[PDB]
């Protein structure tokens, strides 16, 4: 009975990476914060002092 909806992941289609700087910056920024949210925190360090 299983049924899903195709994700539709056609690539770039639009090449903004060659003029729309203004917006890339906004993307990068975004994708970046996104990243930090994931990058696991570290553990077992050497006592600062």
């Amino acid at each position: 009975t299983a049924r899903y909806i195709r994700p539709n992941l056609l690539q770039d289609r639009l090449n903004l990476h060659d003029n729309f700087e203004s917006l890339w910056d906004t993307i990068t920024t975004s994708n970046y914060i996104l990243a930090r949210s994931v990058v696991p925190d570290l553990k077992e360090l050497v006592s600062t002092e």
């Binding site: 203004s22 917006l23 910056d25 906004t26 920024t29 975004s30």
Partner: peptide, 28 residues
Amino acid sequence: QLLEVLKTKEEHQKEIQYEILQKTIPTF
């Protein structure tokens, strides 16, 4: 004395402009 009354009159100039740019960047 001068090298610190000019890291404040150069963080207005630097500011306003570093921003006049941020208005060209649709970043929340």
